[PDB]
């Protein structure tokens, strides 16, 4: 229980600040003018909270966690920053990997299990058609996900170990993980309980912190991304809208589902929509249903900018008060875009029993551990039609791809 | 309730991204 947000306010408060805010709070909770329920622990709390931060000595130690977390994130940038200045390049050849099985399929290319040939390891496979790319006018996002994702570390995202290009493709060769898209998992259980989907929403929480302390915006959360490692562990796939942006950025891009209203709208926007698609994902995952569908884009549109949203009643109360906090369609209000940024999720009612360091070093007892059947199995991933990989003599889209 | 109007739908698949 975060003794700042007890007494509201701010980390860098006066000693004057915290007397007052103190006085303020108290009176509040005070039994003299506060019978009802739970005033006698809010008026412990806040008592607490004034004897930690008004003692420097007990204030420096409790300031150490922010401290932490501070320092992580700068060595993070550093080491992030070096690999965005020196990318690896061509650090692979196709003729290195068996293809196996295709794992799905997209209007890019497609992504295949594949299994190096000298180490036996497995490998999943995105196949990207230069031509296709160039047609789709995706040649920048696809220099971006190569470009961030060979840059990034952290648990929750996939791993990229080796990119190259032929004549005729572009190929990313990440880590397999054989659970399978959240997506998969979701749909046939129905929904999660609270708990779980707690668990997995945590995870989220910390990898944005992460991302937008590198000045990245994801732009594609949705359980299809969410890959389940062995331990039951997120893991984050697909960074092809993933943008490096310190301003405001404009582009349509995304799943109309959990796209944010100043995404729609035509005006710019930041990396708060990351934390309005963090709502549209609680809420699937704990209702089994988004927010918002609809058979034509323009309607989810229509609903999403609507201001209106409908909650099941097996809806806990701190669920429904986050969900009506990161679904603010005015985003000088919207939760994770304030003063305390991501400390207000952090610090909510609803995450309350979240041990966040734990959860990064994954510690937490997961509540489901998909089907493990071998290091190669393909259980948990549905079934695509097959088609051989075509490789021109002739050079395509030389100059478009030089960077990759 | 909305989850039986979710699967009486057909946006019960996998949601395709738009790129514009
Ligand atoms: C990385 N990884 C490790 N184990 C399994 C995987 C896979 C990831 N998927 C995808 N990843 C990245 N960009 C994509 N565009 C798509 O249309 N699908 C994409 C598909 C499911 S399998």
Known sequence: ?404 | TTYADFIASGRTGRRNAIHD
């Open chain 1, 1 to 404: 229980k975060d003794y700042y947000q007890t007494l509201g306010l701010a980390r860098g408060a006066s000693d004057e600040e915290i007397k007052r805010a103190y006085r303020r709070q108290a009176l509040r909770y005070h039994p003299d003018k506060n019978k009802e329920p739970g005033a006698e622990e809010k008026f412990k709390e806040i008592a607490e909270a004034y004897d930690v931060l008004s003692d420097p000595r007990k204030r420096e130690i409790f300031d150490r966690y922010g401290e932490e977390v501070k320092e992580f994130l700068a060595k993070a940038k550093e080491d992030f920053l070096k690999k965005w200045e020196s990318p690896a390049q061509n650090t692979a050849h196709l003729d290195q990997f068996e293809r196996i099985k295709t794992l799905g399929t997209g209007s890019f290319g497609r992504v295949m299990l594949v299994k190096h040939k000298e180490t036996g390891n497995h490998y999943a496979m995105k196949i990207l058609d230069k031509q296709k790319v160039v047609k789709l006018k995706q040649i920048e996002h696809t220099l971006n996900e190569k470009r961030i994702l060979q840059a990034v570390n952290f648990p929750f995202l996939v791993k990229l170990e080796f990119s190259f290009k032929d004549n005729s493709n572009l190929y990313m060769v990440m880590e397999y993980v054989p659970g399978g898209e959240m997506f998969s998992h979701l749909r046939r259980i129905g929904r999660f309980s609270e708990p779980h989907a707690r668990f997995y929403a945590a995870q989220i929480v910390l990898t944005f912190e992460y991302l937008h302390s590198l000045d990245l915006i994801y732009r594609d959360l949705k359980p299809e991304n969410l890959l389940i490692d062995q331990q039951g562990y997120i893991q984050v796939t697909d960074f092809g809208f993933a943008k490096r942006v310190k301003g405001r950025t404009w582009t349509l891009c995304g799943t109309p589902e959990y796209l944010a209203p100043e995404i729609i709208l035509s005006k710019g926007y930041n990396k708060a929509v990351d934390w309005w698609a963090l709502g549209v994902l609680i809420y699937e995952m704990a209702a089994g249903y988004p927010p918002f569908f609809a058979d034509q884009p323009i309607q989810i549109y229509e609903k999403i900018v609507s201001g209106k949203v409908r909650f099941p009643s097996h809806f806990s109360s701190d669920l429904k008060d986050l969900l009506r906090n990161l679904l603010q369609v005015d985003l000088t209000k919207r939760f994770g875009n304030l003063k305390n940024g991501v400390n207000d999720i952090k610090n909510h009612k609803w995450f309350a029993t979240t041990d966040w360091i734990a959860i990064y070093q994954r510690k937490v007892e997961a509540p489901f551990i998909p089907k493990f059947k071998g290091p190669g199995d393909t259980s948990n991933f549905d079934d695509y039609e097959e088609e051989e990989i075509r490789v021109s003599i002739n050079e395509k889209c030389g100059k478009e791809f030089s960077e990759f």
